[PDB]
Amino acid sequence: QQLSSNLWAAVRARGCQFLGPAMQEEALKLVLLALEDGSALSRKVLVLFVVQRLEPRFPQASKTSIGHVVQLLYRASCFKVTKRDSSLMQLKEEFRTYEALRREHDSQIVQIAMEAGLRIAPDQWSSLLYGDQSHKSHMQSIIDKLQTP
């Protein structure tokens, strides 16, 4: 798809990455593993935690690519950041379950598509983000919220 290619180019243009439906899911679940309980990790340590556990099952995982995944979450305003002179990152309380964090994640990607002027329907979103046709109403719901006049 040209559509997919333009979307991911748009995502990369903003310092972010989507690693693919299977890999991104596991990445996000590992972010949760580290931050569920409100632990406060630097970006370095968060990336390290996730790459460490992701790479065994998805060997192409890197500090660079997972940094770009975390940046996507940062851009989605998922973190409470405590600055210091090296900042520490906490998952906002409202996003400490997978479905909630994943929803904010997807929504940020839909915002990016909107910025990039890319018109994408829910069945396409379901393919792009989940690699199935079982997430249409999830994506449609995200779209509805972003399309308030």
Residue numbers in the entry: 177 to 261, 264 to 327
Quote from the publication:
The protein Roquin (encoded by Rc3h1), known to bind target mRNAs and promote their decay, has been found to be crucial in the maintenance of peripheral immune tolerance. Roquin is a ubiquitously expressed RING-E3 ubiquitin ligase family member containing a highly conserved ROQ domain required for RNA binding and localization to stress granules and a CCCH zinc finger motif. Roquin binds a stem-loop structure termed the constitutive decay element (CDE) within the 3′-UTR of Tnf mRNA and recruits the Ccr4-Caf1-Not deadenylation machinery leading to mRNA decay. mRNA degradation can also be mediated by Roquin’s recruitment of Rck/Edc4/Dcp1a decapping complexes and is thought to occur independently of miRNA activity. Our work identifies a role of the immune modulator Roquin in regulating mammalian miRNA homeostasis by promoting mature miR-146a degradation.
To gain insight into the molecular details of the interaction of Roquin with RNA, we determined the crystal structures of the ROQ domain (residues 177–326, to 2.2 Å) and a larger construct containing the RING, ROQ and zinc-finger domains (residues 1–484, to 2.75 Å) that incorporated the ‘san’ mutation M199R. There were two copies of the ROQ domain in the asymmetric unit of the first structure, with a dimer interface of 759 Å2. In Roquin, the 150-residue ROQ domain is inserted between helices 2 and 3 of the HEPN domain (beige) and is mostly α-helical. The domain boundaries differed slightly from those suggested by earlier sequence analyses. It has seven α-helices interrupted by a short β-strand between helices 2 and 3 and a β-hairpin between helices 4 and 5 (α1-α2-β1-α3-α4-α2-α3-α5-α6-α7). There are no other examples of the overall fold of the ROQ domain in the Protein Data Bank, and therefore this can be considered a new protein fold. The ROQ domain can be subdivided into an N-terminal winged helix–turn–helix (α2 to β3), followed by a C-terminal helix–turn–helix (lacking the ‘wing’ of the first, α5 to α7). These were preceded by an extra helix (α1) that appears to stabilize the relative orientation of the two sub-domains. A comparison of our Roquin1–484 structure with that of the wild-type ROQ domain demonstrated that the M199R mutation induces only a minor conformational perturbation but one that is likely to interfere with binding to either an RNA or a protein ligand. Although M199 and R199 occupied a similar spatial position, the presence of the mutation (located at the N terminus of α2) resulted in distortion of the C terminus of nearby α3 and the loop that follows it. In particular, E231 and R233 are shifted significantly and F234 flips out from its position between α2 and α3 to become completely solvent exposed.
